[PDB]
Write an enzyme that holds these catalytic residues in place. Structure first.
Site, short mmCIF file in Angstrom:
data_model
loop_
_atom_site.label_atom_id
_atom_site.label_comp_id
_atom_site.label_asym_id
_atom_site.label_seq_id
_atom_site.Cartn_x
_atom_site.Cartn_y
_atom_site.Cartn_z
CG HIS A 82 -1.77 -1.21 1.38
ND1 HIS A 82 -2.74 -1.52 0.44
CD2 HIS A 82 -1.80 -2.13 2.34
CE1 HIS A 82 -3.37 -2.60 0.83
NE2 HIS A 82 -2.79 -3.02 1.96
CG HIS A 115 2.90 5.92 5.72
ND1 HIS A 115 2.60 5.83 7.06
CD2 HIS A 115 1.82 6.48 5.16
CE1 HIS A 115 1.41 6.36 7.28
NE2 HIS A 115 0.88 6.79 6.10
CG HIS A 171 -0.73 8.55 1.62
ND1 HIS A 171 -1.47 7.39 1.60
CD2 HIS A 171 -0.38 8.80 2.90
CE1 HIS A 171 -1.63 6.98 2.90
NE2 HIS A 171 -0.94 7.81 3.69
CD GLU A 228 -3.96 9.61 2.44
OE1 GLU A 228 -3.66 9.58 3.62
OE2 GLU A 228 -4.51 8.68 1.83
CG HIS A 240 0.44 10.54 6.64
ND1 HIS A 240 -0.54 9.81 6.01
CD2 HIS A 240 0.20 11.85 6.45
CE1 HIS A 240 -1.36 10.67 5.46
NE2 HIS A 240 -0.96 11.94 5.66
CB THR A 243 -5.96 8.23 5.36
OG1 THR A 243 -4.65 7.69 5.13
CG2 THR A 243 -5.91 9.53 6.13
#
Ligand code: VGT
Ligand code: VGT
Ligand code: ZN
Length: 258
Positions: free
Chosen positions: A62, A92, A94, A104, A117, A196
């Site tokens: 992910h 991590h 996104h 996000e 994050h 999230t």
């Protein structure tokens, strides 16, 4: 099958296995900068990362996580909206397929190229798994990335990604200093929200920094060479691993700054 970010298992599907997806404090959200109220009672953030012990980097299918030793108070977040001490467990990102998407949270509906994050858990609950069952269990420090100049402190992360291309791969990742990922200012917005990704637990105090960090186009191109798939499986590039903005509902976003 499993949740993910594809056409058939993406965010619009998650509610079927995780009904809290339609809950009252879901993340991320759009930050309307004119509607956020300055709260002069909010404290400066205390980010204490000088003794951070990074251990490993993991492609989980992910994203990738940089994991820390959280068996002692080595790297902690305190102050701002928080009561007590929150221990760093992992960070991590996104990111998008293109520079015009990937974050996000959004700011006046602006999407950034990516979002970092830094995940912390409240030490009064003893372990991460207990903390995610509590409304004040986690504190996630969110930092926007924009494409421009390279971030020198990110390059050690970029250079190890070829060794964790596919789901389930990990590599040793010691002595990484997460202070190299911060912007200059710790001005922030804060609101109560959720994880999230599934399981979308409503356990997070979100702290989103106003000042983005700059990364280079070459740095984010390397994130986009990761794979969602396992080794030997048809290649599915790890891109667009972001959940869109969720309804704010009965919440107020507070600003640390005027
Ligand atoms: N998010 S969730 O947990 O509620 C969840 C759980 C299960 C499922 S079924 C997903 C599958 O029908 C299709 Se993947 C596919 C797509 C393109 C090419 C090859 C294969 C979807 C979402
Ligand atoms: N993007 S984000 O920053 O909001 C974020 C941060 C952390 C995660 S950990 C998701 C799962 O691996 C662990 Se939840 C769990 C762990 C133990 C027991 C029960 C449930 C998910 C999303
Ligand atoms: Zn995240």
């Amino acid at each position: 099958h499993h949740w993910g970010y594809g056409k058939h298992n993406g965010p619009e599907h998650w509610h079927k296995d995780f009904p809290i997806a339609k809950g009252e404090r879901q993340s991320p959200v759009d930050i309307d900068t004119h509607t956020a109220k300055y709260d002069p009672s909010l404290k400066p953030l205390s980010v204490s990362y000088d003794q951070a012990t990074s251990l490993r980097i993991l492609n989980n299918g992910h994203a990738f996580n940089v994991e820390f030793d959280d068996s002692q108070d080595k790297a902690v977040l305190k102050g701002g909206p928080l009561d007590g001490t929150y221990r760093l467990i992992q960070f991590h990102f996104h990111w998008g397929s293109l520079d015009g998407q990937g974050s996000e949270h959004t700011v006046d509906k602006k999407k950034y190229a990516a979002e970092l994050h830094l995940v912390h858990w409240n030490t009064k609950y003893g372990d991460f798994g207990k903390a995610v069952q509590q409304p004040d269990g986690l504190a996630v420090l969110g930092i926007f990335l924009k494409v421009g100049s390279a971030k020198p402190g990110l390059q050690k992360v970029v250079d190890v990604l070829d060794s964790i291309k596919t789901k389930g791969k990990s590599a040793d990742f010691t002595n990484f200093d997460p202070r190299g990922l911060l912007p200059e200012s710790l001005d922030y917005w804060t609101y109560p929200g959720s994880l999230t990704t599934p399981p979308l637990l409503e356990c997070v105090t979100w702290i989103v920094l106003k000042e983005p960090i700059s990364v280079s186009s070459e740095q984010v191109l390397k994130f986009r060479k990761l794979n969602f798939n396992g080794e030997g499986e048809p290649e599915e590039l790890m891109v667009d691993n972001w959940r869109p903005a969720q309804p704010l509902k009965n919440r107020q976003i507070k600003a640390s700054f005027k």
